[PDB]
Write a structure and sequence with these properties.
Strand order of the largest sheet: 15-14-9-1-2-5-18
Structural class: alpha+beta
PDB class: hydrolase/dna/rna
Radius of gyration: 38 Å
Name: CRISPR-associated endonuclease Cas9/Csn1
Number of helices: 57
Assembly: tetrameric
Number of strands: 28
Entry title: Crystal structure of xCas9 in complex with sgRNA and DNA (CGG PAM)
Distance between the termini: 49 Å
Keywords: endonuclease, HYDROLASE-DNA-RNA complex
RNA sequence: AUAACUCAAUUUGUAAAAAAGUUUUAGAGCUAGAAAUAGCAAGUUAAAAUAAGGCUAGUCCGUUAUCAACUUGAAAAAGUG
DNA sequence: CAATACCGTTTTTTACAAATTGAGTTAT
DNA sequence: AAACGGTATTG
């Protein structure tokens, strides 16, 4: 009767198992529906659902936002053409049409094929005169002549279409007129102060050096080499760093506290410089106001590098510089190939397949791939000197439109747009009148805090209209309510107070929130001095004075400040011992001081009468980050403040939200006392009750008034947990298998459910970690030992680099060729913490350098290495967490309680995600109440970590080999049920920890020995029992036999979740034209034989069609049965009307009643038990699991790791004994592969390989057998190696055989099947 | 197990922007040759598209999540061994 | 028909909220 | 980032 369920919850599977009293897995007879002659079947109640990962919403979002970018850029051009429409119609009334049809081949074009002037002589003339658009852009900026309107339009349209970035705020004029002197205005402002060590400027060419072909980083070095007696990280070299753009320490420059890096482009900087200047005095911001005055020209230099006082179009002129240089260098490279290498010219200048010029210009070859190719050639010939200077500088044969124009800000483009408009407005009255309109098309940008400009058909939209009517760059302010919209952008994402759930949380930085924060910490500080019996609470008055004197004067108050500045001076004690605060108060009045600095007067802060004004100011400063909108919402308090001060508040932005509301903190009243929570936190007699105390006090009304304010789908519930969509898919399925297992078990609930649930890009972030950390350390280790990204995925090499080539425990340089002789020691030993992260790993010469094994590293070490752990910490080359764990011995180290804590974590699952899954299953199984209206827990939900079954597997030789088949998930769920239920039968004490719903030494020994009742020796007995109840928990000499027998059962229900495919219509590669039915038109009228198009559409699902086709001149109707793949693009027109769709495909007399949907993984059974899974309309997958006997699984396990005491005698002697298990396994793979795989040629290749490698070691043959299973695995054929032989995938490239096979519709567990024979439909 | 605070690190979800890439056309190829083909010249730029599309017609929406079969249901889901 | 092999859009920036993990403080 | 279905090309 009684039973339990076991579950193993992964991202790609749910393992499940039903067990009874004696840890047995029952079997039953299940109906078999359908049209076959089998009416029923025996099944074991063990199984696994397999499924493809749920994906994140990201890909979908980056597509969505780019789509919106595309539609808006189109609108940008359509705004400009609409302005030009009238006057364009008088110059050339087909001009906008010829442009829209530029894509179409001549035979589909309505107008003459030359787009700009609609004839060949004028178009050839345009290109000879304006080889690039930048040549035209410069001309229209500088020239004063009336221009052709078409030419005007094309220059503005290109600037509006490719308009650059919105990263810099406000206005940009090119100033490169005085980099030869701005530099020497700052050499003199710095040479007045440091008049006792003056810098020889020697009219040195700063114009060149700072702003060369080369970088910023280097360009500093090269300037400071040209200055005798100046450390390149000295005060002038530090300033000069900034004037480029880098963050120096500035710390030793002036010998202060911590590090005072700046950055002239960050907004922090106006306000930040007086953080350094309010240390060294206002007398030194003429050395920074001469170092902003060059922070300009250095900004623009790397793009522009053309004298700006001879063109208002420095950008286009720079582009023309690349065009001319490209022209010269190529006529030269051509001469120098002809005179010195002429046999190669065709390859370099005609062959597109090869990454020469032909490849660069007309093939698929990149600037990098081109440069890589001809460096050999260009140096394998003299004369090519100055050409190679450029190749190394990435200045050689540059295109104008390239990866690096990313840096160009929209303000540069706007400069030329403005210029051109000022020129031609003199001739074109419409341009003068619409100059501001046009400039606005380039400039306008929907604010991120407004979002889609929707009309309540966008699930993503939130913006509000003042006016129902079309939004435009021009009417935007008058029609969008930017304020309402900026607020919703935040409010629609923010929390409500969990205790008063209709009240919204306060801004984290609210003065009231911070008062709450401080008083809560402060009302539990307790002190003791001279002749006081015990330590006591602070009082009301005491807290007021401590708040008033200390908290309202310094960001941090320290325990020292509370001893020396308070108790010493007002309470007059010589020594005071305080408890509840260590070092400094976590809470602080951050906003109080921020606001004191900007509004001078403290009486205004301290005056309660105007608390509401002050809360609304910070709410404004939190809600918005647009200083305009701040200023607009702040000007209502401009009556109560100076001019100077509104310019300072306008700047004081804040970020973050509380967990609590104003109402809860300081509105709601204890009925009795009439006091708010904050009221109590300020003064609560001699009780000094906490926030969380007051919430839970029966003596007070807060507990029930909160109860009053409280308020009450599965799919919804799950999808709204915090966790990876991948793991959320596993969760929903496990809930659906549990629901099925209850139905099969007669709607009877289980006794218990035992869940356990598993734990270039990686290599580009690491390289970023490495580069930035060494830059911060200033270490030449990279020049000494250079590294490609992808070899930093070696754990020893990455740790070597993150350690600056040093032993992390000794202060000795590590030799980079000896990593082999070096240990990777865990910081917290693995014996306590199962963490394989870089966060708890370190590289050392000898692991023993750490100190003793049984703790965190030695104080001796910590003492000697510390200053070194904090260089790496300040460099991001370790995290605070690694740092805190390295140093821990100086704070005492690992307490016996700490160690016991960790041994518990290894067995007790604490992750919030797995707890919710338990809670869901508890709430769903336990729904019943008693006479007294108490919840009846009819079902215990039990949570294990994976270590328990992994240990139990290793400890009793129930080895998993993952790659034999999919059974191990099922197996794990079974072993969870048995270890689960057994464990709380032996120790009902542990329900505390495992069931939802000298004292450290004992705990420690207890949990590390908890699992001993399974073992016969450690002297303890066969039958094992519950002390109090006298229940049998484990027949140690029979219960292991039932576990061996269950794991041996060949018939385990494995189910691949069948799925309709969704996603991109096809691959995205826009292919060239080819004659081929495969190409898919990128638009209705673009025949892919003329225009190219898409390849490879995804089939959403396949559909069995029985119909007729026409054959012959005759069109005699011929019967067909086959699968047609319905593509994601097609699916919706196929569903609107199945018939019409198939009839358009060539089908007749379609039998509509035999159309079967066949989603991906649809399972078919053929001859001899052979099964196939549908991959697609014309591709199948391996649908069988190979049930290898357990004696072979174990042999493969141990064999494959001879790297395993007197226990390893029996282990290595079992392998050597049963070496003939090798042949017996090869034979099991071939009998399987011959009856079900049908890869005749691939089998011969594995057999020849096996027999050829027989004299090789057993270990090495077993590792290689484990590869051979990929031959046999369920799913898509895939390549594997045998030793050195590669066996390429034998693929199933037709679905015809399944048309006459048996379709098997499986329920989620596999227990219920509907079997269809398809030989019984096709006429 | 749970709440607030502090510090660090993660993960999820949203919006606003940028630069390329690719595709077709445009940018008169020249000269010998009956042609097959052979010499030389040339190249850096632009337009337009960037899921087909959709109706709600917005400067919106269009790749996430959810899916055995049978009956019921627009669906969500429920009933069926 | 089978064996064989090739291919696959990419980078970057700004603004924000939430939950989570894990080292501290105070509590239910 | 592979993995593995689309595609062509080869007899």
């Amino acid at each position: 009767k009684k039973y339990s369920i076991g579950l193993a919850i992964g991202t790609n599977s749910v393992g499940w198992a039903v067990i009874t009293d004696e840890y047995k897995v029952p079997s039953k007879k299940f109906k078999v529906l359908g049209n076959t002659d089998r009416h029923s079947i025996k099944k074991n109640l063990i199984g696994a659902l397999l499924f493809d990962s749920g994906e994140t919403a990201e890909a979908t979002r980056l597509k969505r936002t780019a789509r919106r970018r595309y539609t808006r850029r189109k609108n940008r051009i359509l705004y400009l053409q609409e302005i030009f429409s009238n006057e364009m119609a008088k110059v050339d009334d087909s001009f906008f049409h010829r442009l829209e049809e530029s894509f179409l081949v001549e035979e589909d074009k309505k107008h003459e094929r030359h787009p700009i002037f609609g004839n060949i002589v004028d178009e050839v003339a345009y290109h000879e005169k304006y080889p690039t658009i930048y040549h035209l852009r410069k001309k229209l900026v500088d020239s004063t002549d009336k221009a052709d309107l078409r030419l005007i339009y094309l220059a503005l349209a290109h600037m509006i279409k490719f308009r650059g970035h919105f990263l810099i705020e406000g206005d940009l004029n090119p100033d490169n007129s005085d980099v030869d002197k701005l530099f020497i205005q700052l050499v003199q402002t710095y040479n007045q102060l440091f008049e006792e060590n003056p810098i020889n400027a020697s009219g040195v060419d700063a114009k060149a050096i700072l702003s060369a072909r080369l970088s910023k980083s280097r360009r500093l070095e090269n300037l400071i080499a040209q200055l005798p007696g100046e450390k390149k990280n000295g005060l002038f070299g530090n300033l000069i760093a900034l004037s480029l753009g880098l963050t120096p320490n500035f710390k030793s420059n002036f010998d202060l506290a911590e590090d005072t890096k700046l950055q002239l482009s960050k907004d922090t900087y106006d306000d930040d410089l007086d953080n350094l200047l309010a240390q060294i005095g206002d007398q030194y911001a003429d050395l920074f106001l001469a170092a902003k005055n060059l922070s300009d020209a250095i900004l623009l230099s790397d793009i522009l590098r053309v004298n700006t006082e001879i063109t208002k179009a420095p950008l286009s002129a720079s582009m023309i510089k690349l065009y001319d240089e490209h022209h010269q260098d190529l006529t030269l490279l051509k001469a120098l190939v002809r005179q010195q290498l002429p046999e190669k010219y065709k390859e370099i200048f005609f062959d597109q397949s090869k990454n020469g010029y032909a490849g660069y210009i007309d093939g698929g070859a990149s600037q990098e791939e081109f440069y890589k190719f001809i460096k050999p050639i260009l140096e394998k010939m003299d004369g090519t000197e100055e050409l190679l200077v450029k190749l190394n500088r990435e200045d050689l044969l540059r295109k104008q439109r390239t990866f690096d124009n990313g840096i160009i800000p929209h303000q540069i483009h706007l400069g030329e747009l403005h210029a051109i408009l000022r020129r031609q407005e003199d001739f074109y009255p419409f341009l003068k009148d619409n100059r501001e309109k046009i400039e606005k098309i380039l400039t306008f940008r929907i604010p991120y805090y407004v979002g889609p400009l929707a009309r309540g058909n966008s699930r993503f939209a939130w913006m509000t209209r003042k006016s129902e009517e079309t939004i435009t760059p021009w009417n935007f302010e008058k029609v969008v309510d930017k304020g309402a919209s900026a607020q919703s952008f935040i409010e629609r994402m923010t929390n409500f107070d969990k205790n008063l759930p209709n009240e919204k949380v306060l801004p984290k930085h609210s003065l009231l929130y911070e008062y709450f924060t401080v008083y809560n910490e402060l009302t539990k500080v307790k002190y003791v001095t001279e002749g006081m019996r015990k330590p006591a609470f602070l009082s009301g008055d005491q807290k007021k004075a401590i708040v008033d004197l200390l908290f309202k004067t310094n960001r941090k108050v320290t325990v020292k400040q509370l001893k020396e500045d308070y108790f010493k001076k007002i309470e007059e004690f010589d020594s005071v011992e305080i408890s509840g605060v260590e070092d400094r108060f976590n809470a602080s009045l951050g906003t109080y001081h921020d606001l004191l600095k900007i509004i001078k007067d403290k009486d205004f802060l301290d005056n309660e009468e105007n608390e509401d004004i002050l809360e609304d100011i910070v709410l404004t400063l939190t809600l918005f980050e647009d200083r305009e909108m701040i200023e607009e919402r702040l000007k209502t308090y401009a009556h109560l403040f100076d001019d100077k001060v509104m310019k300072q508040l306008k700047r004081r932005r804040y970020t973050g939200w509380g967990r609590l509301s104003r109402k809860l903190i300081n509105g709601i009243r204890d009925k009795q006392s009439g006091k708010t929570i904050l009221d109590f936190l300020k003064s609560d007699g001699f009780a000094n009750r906490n926030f969380i105390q007051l919430i839970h006090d029966d003596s007070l009304t807060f507990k029930e008034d909160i109860q009053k304010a409280q308020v009450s789908s599965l799919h919804e519930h799950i999808a709204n947990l915090a966790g990876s969509p991948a793991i959320k898919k596993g969760i929903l399925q496990t809930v659906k298998v549990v629901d099925e297992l209850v139905k099969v078990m007669g709607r009877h609930k289980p006794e218990n459910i035992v869940i356990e649930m598993a734990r270039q890009k990686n290599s580009r972030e690491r390289m970023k970690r490495i580069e930035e950390g060494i830059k911060e350390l200033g270490s030449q280790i990279l020049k000494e030992h250079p590294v490609e990204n992808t070899q930093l995925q070696n754990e020893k090499l990455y740790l070597y680099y993150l350690q600056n080539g040093r032993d992390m425990y000794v202060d000795q340089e590590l030799d980079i060729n000896r990593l082999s002789d070096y240990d990777v020691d865990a910081i917290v030993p693995q014996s306590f913490l199962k963490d394989d992260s870089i966060d708890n790993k370190v590289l050392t010469r000898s692991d023993k350098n750490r100190g003793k094994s049984d703790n965190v590293p030695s104080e001796e070490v910590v003492k000697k290495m510390k200053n070194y752990w904090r260089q790496l910490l300040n460099a991001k080359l370790i995290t605070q967490r690694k740092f805190d764990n390295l140093t821990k011995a100086e704070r005492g180290g690992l307490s016996e309680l700490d160690k016991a804590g960790f041994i518990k974590r290894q067995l007790v699952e604490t992750r919030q995600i797995t707890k919710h899954v338990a809670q869901i299953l508890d709430s769903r199984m336990n729904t019943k109440y008693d006479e007294n209206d108490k919840l009846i827990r009819e079902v215990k939900v039990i949570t294990l970590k994976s270590k328990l079954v992994s240990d139990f597997r290793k400890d009793f030789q129930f080895y998993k080999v993952r790659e034999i088949n999919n059974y191990h998930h099922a197996h794990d769920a079974y072993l969870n049920a048995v270890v689960g239920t057994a464990l709380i039968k032996k120790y009902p004490k542990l329900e505390s920890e495992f069931v939802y719903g000298g004292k450290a030494t004992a705990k420690y020994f207890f949990y590390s020995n908890i699992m001993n009742f399974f073992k016969t020796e450690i002297k303890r007995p066969l039958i094992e029992t519950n002390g109090e109840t006298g229940e049998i928990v484990w027949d140690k000499g029979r219960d292991f036999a039932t576990v061996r027998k269950v794991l041996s059962m060949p018939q385990v229900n494995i189910v691949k979740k069948t799925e309709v495919q969704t996603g991109g219509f096809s691959k995205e590669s826009i292919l060239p034209k080819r004659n081929s039915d495969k190409l898919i038109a990128r638009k209705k009228d673009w025949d892919p034989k003329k225009y190219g198009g898409f390849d490879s559409p995804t089939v959403a699902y396949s559909v069995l069609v029985v119909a007729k086709v026409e054959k012959g001149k005759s069109k005699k109707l011929k019967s067909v049965k086959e699968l047609l793949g319905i593509t994601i693009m097609e699916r919706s027109s196929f569903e609107k009307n199945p018939i019409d769709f198939l009839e358009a495909k060539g089908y007749k007399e379609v039998k509509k009643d035999l159309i079967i949907k066949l989603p991906k993984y649809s399972l078919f059974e053929l001859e001899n038990g052979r099964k196939r899974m549908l991959a697609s309309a014309g591709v199948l997958q391996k649908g069988n699991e190979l049930a290898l006997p357990s004696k072979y699984v174990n042999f493969l396990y141990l064999a494959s790791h001879y790297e395993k005491p007197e226990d390893n005698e029996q282990k290595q002697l079992f392998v050597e004994q049963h070496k003939h298990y090798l042949d017996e396994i090869i034979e099991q793979i071939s009998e399987f592969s011959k009856r079900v795989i049908l890869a005749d040629a691939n089998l011969d290749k594995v057999l020849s390989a096996y027999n050829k490698h027989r004299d090789k070691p057993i270990r090495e043959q077993a590792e290689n057998i484990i590869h051979l299973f990929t031959l046999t695995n369920l799913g898509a054929p895939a390549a594997f190696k045998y030793f050195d032989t590669t066996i390429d995938r034998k693929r199933y490239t037709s679905t015809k055989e399944v048309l006459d096979a048996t379709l098997i519709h499986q329920s989620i567990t596999g227990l219920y099947e509907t079997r269809i024979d398809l030989s019984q439909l096709g006429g």
